[PDB]
Design a protein around this ligand. Sequence first.
Ligand SMILES: CCCCCCCCCCCC(=O)O
Ligand SMILES: CCCCCCCCCCCC(=O)O
Ligand SMILES: [Fe+2]
Ligand SMILES: [Fe+2]
Ligand SMILES: [Fe+2]
Ligand SMILES: [Fe+2]
Ligand SMILES: [Mn+2]
Ligand SMILES: [Mn+2]
Lengths: 273, 272
Amino acid sequence: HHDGFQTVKATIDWEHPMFKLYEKAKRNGKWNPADIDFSQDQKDFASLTSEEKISALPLVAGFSAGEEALTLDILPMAHALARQGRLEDVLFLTTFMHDEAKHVEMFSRWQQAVGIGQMDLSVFHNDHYKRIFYEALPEAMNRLYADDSPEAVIRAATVYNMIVEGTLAESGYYTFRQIYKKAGLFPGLLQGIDYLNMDEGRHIQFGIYTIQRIVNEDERYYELFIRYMDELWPHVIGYVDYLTELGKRIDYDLLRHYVIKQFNLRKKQISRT
Amino acid sequence: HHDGFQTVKATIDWEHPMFKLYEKAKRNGKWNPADIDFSQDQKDFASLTSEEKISALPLVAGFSAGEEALTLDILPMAHALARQGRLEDVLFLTTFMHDEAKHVEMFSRWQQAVGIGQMDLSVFHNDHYKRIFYEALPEAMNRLYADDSPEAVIRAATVYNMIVEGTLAESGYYTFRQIYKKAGLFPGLLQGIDYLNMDEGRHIQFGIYTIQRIVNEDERYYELFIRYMDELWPHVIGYVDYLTELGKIDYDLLRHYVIKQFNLRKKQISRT
Ligand SMILES: CCCCCCCCCCCC(=O)O
Ligand SMILES: CCCCCCCCCCCC(=O)O
Ligand SMILES: [Fe+2]
Ligand SMILES: [Fe+2]
Ligand SMILES: [Fe+2]
Ligand SMILES: [Fe+2]
Ligand SMILES: [Mn+2]
Ligand SMILES: [Mn+2]
């Protein structure tokens, strides 16, 4: 039941940082996956040999499931914040959810255009990927439906925004650029990564804001954050190591360093105070 | 746990009705309430006498809370359809939810701009309004977290889309355009309501699709639908009586429009 409603008793808190992020989202989130021209990606992918074709599919496999997972699995967080009456957070999170929807859309349109929609790409999800995306992500998020304690929220934001988005996805978009922008391939996909990467800059700020406002209330949660971050690293690097051993069948060692740098960069964006 | 992912094993169902609605929402849902100029609404409202001022507030009280409730209360529908694997529905529902947020945002900006933001407008929610918006809507939606049965999804769509949106809000925005476009008042608010009314045309199609695809399985659900509508009617009309009495403009035109809207919704679902 609703006790009452903030916009009948008062107003939106116009100064709230998440309301300010919501405003920037509507401003900067107008791109439409449907408007991306994929006709050259179609040609590029066709003129690839069968061996140069496989090279692209693992990254794509991780993005398409990842974004679909991201779209489904933000709903518990939106629910938990709404129940706590953090209305500006909810407003913003509508833009987050609809961004992820566009992310899933873009990757699927790409698959359709280049002619692999009928192909099952689950075979490039190794155990470590499954542990993050099939299991640890929805488990941490669905927890919020019955346990919205600071500890559960910090863990949801850590898995979702700091590890999946902030470490894995940031690194894979960097990687996709590294490899394909230089080879001059898949411009429609690269336009779409570009849009996606701008969206995700907002998503991470919500994750930082959420972890930090929980840390601010009790510095003991800073150690929970660092700990959960470290608990997921083995699967982060286990997914990375698997992708490397596939591509090795392109400086993998400067991609591996970027994943590590991203991981440590996220850590340093939360302070104990 | 995720069993797998549709866009790794296959693709989006590009021909699904809710994906087509999703595609349309993106095309047609670009408005930003931050861009509406409310400077004249401020002046108009200040030009009103104290008695004229309070004549506007109950309808605004109904709208602001209603859009707030609607933003919060679609989330369980998103979850339950997501849990059933209806990805294209979920994609659409992201545009539905972001629309409602813009709707709440608009009315709050209007209250801020005309200088009534500090004023608690709950006083204009009577017992019938509270029955619907504080209680029945959130009960119906939250049910879906533990009971996604046909009966539960029908009852959620019936209350959310068919009564709240399709009967009460449709009639309210009709009511407001009629009174204030004729008075030449609140041009920024009226512009936001035009935008809102376009959004909401997509929303009602999702609710029609949802209720009819379930009814299509079993015509026992058509009778469930009709009953859930009639169950809510005494509160719809009780709130309409409350506002008309407050006001006391052709009140009987407006009141008959609500009944029209309610019958209209009934007739958008067919037994087969
Ligand atoms: C050695 C490869 C380095 C790149 C690692 C990033 C892999 C992550 C793929 C994207 C997963 C996702 O967020 O959807
Ligand atoms: C004077 C006749 C009243 C017409 C119905 C007005 C109902 C207004 C409340 C709408 C709230 C909402 O569903 O967002
Ligand atoms: Fe994201
Ligand atoms: Fe391993
Ligand atoms: Fe709506
Ligand atoms: Fe009554
Ligand atoms: Mn994304
Ligand atoms: Mn609305």
